[PDB]
Amino acid sequence: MVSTIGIVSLSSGIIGEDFVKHEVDLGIQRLKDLGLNPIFLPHSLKGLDFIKDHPEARAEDLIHAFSDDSIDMILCAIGGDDTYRLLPYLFENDQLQKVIKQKIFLGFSDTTMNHLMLHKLGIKTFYGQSFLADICELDKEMLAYSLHYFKELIETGRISEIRPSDVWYEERTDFSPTALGTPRVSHTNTGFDLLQGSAQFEGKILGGCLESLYDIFDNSRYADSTELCQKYKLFPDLSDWEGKILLLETSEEKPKPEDFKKMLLTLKDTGIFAVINGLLVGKPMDETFHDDYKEALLDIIDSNIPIVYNLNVGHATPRAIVPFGVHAHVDAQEQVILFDYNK
Secondary structure, three states: OOOEEEEEOOOOOHHHOHHHHHHHHHHHHHHHHOOOEEEEOOOOOOOHHHHHHOHHHHHHHHHHHHHOOOOOEEEEOOOOOOHHHHHHHHHOOOOOOOOOOOOEEEEOHHHHHHHHHHHHOOOOOEEOOOHHHHHOOOOOOOOHHHHHHHHHHHHHOOOOEEOOOOEEEOOOOOOOHHHOOOOOOEEEOOOOEEEEOOOEEEEEEEEEEHHHHHHHHOOOOOOOHHHHHHHOOOOOOHHHHOOOEEEEEOOOOOOOHHHHHHHHHHHHOOOHHHHOOEEEEEOOHHHOOHHHHHHHHHHHOOOOOOEEEEEOOOOOEOOOOEEOOOEEEEEOOOOEEEEEOOO
8 A cells, every 4th residue: 555655865866956857747747647646855856966965964865754654665766876975874873773664665776875774774675766767767658667567566565576578778868858758779688698507596685786886895986985884884794695696787887897897806705606595687788798797707706606697677778676685586497586575
């Protein structure tokens, strides 16, 4: 019985900018048609500059979203690259833990950091879509495959299974008003690609955007990312990772193959690939460096660890939604991932 959906800006504040107005109205109408009543949290529409300079305000919006019993679901507006800055405002005095309640939380990319924050507090979240990226798809309707998962989530509170899309789409090259009502360029999608290891494996899924996870360990983007993430122990320990399935997906930054490898090896050094039950990897945006990443994965990760590539999760389109913290059964041969809420 999800009815009210609260939209939050925890990363970029672009959603409140004048030029995005029509897109926002488009998404609002789509949410209404699905049986929902959208509300924007108090700071979420204040714009680029305000949101950038007030991570504490973003945190206050998140705290309110989780503590307000009239809000049934929380949807991230859009990603960015600096939501790690919210950490002290959520954890230094257990501000979020004190008032948090289990309810649907959906986002991706920079939101990976928020997913890890919520994991720390025992909250089961949902990865892979956001308001501007998916609900405000510029074509006449939302992408059918993306809609399938969003509709299922809002109607049932869960995702039961993921199957590959029939098609995938390129990122647009026109973002002016002439883009409205036009389709993205599409291509046939060939399904889950078992790179190595068992076609079947199981466990709860956790992870997200590779570039985001990298900033837990490397401070090149922001000098204090590693300090803050270590201070608040954001990265799960090995006992936590053991027997889980890791999700990785690459962003619009399209990391060059050398950098993709660097990032994988930084994770490998933690022991994560040694304790997980398998690895799921999303299709890169535009399939950029698709074959290079496949070769890098095969080279770096021991061949007894299962890896399934080409998931329609992450920055390519369309986009499935992945429950985190829910036992999953992967079967690459049968092109399906099942979720068991009673295991």
